Symmetry: C4
Subunit: 38 residues, 4 copies
């Protein structure tokens, strides 16, 4: 399942560390300026 | 609890690798230019 | 061996979280604007 | 011990993912334009 975050982004690569750290998730995408995790 | 670092940052997404490496912490923030780890 | 991604990058340091999360790979490189993992 | 990389950097936050991923190191520092790990 997916998760939102409060971490600002312009590109997907920036989302991989928060998504791993916070949720142990392996996939991240930048959506309307914030990281989501999948 | 929280731990500071000496590591300069322009955005919070940059602080997650720092915080995991340095402290095993899963959360962090770029706080007025330096990573804090929570 | 190599597993290319469609994750945008400008610098190889940006690719290591990508490559670790997506493939368990401990190396990579930004190659023509995209992360490549080995 | 220390490890060198051929990964370009302008700031030491950028070295933490490579140093963790390649070497399991907990510290990184940008030196003469390249990440070093310890």
């Amino acid at each position: 399942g997916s998760r939102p975050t409060d971490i600002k982004c312009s590109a997907s690569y920036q989302c991989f560390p928060v998504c791993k750290s916070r949720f142990g998730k392996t996939n991240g995408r930048c959506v309307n300026g914030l990281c989501d995790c999948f």
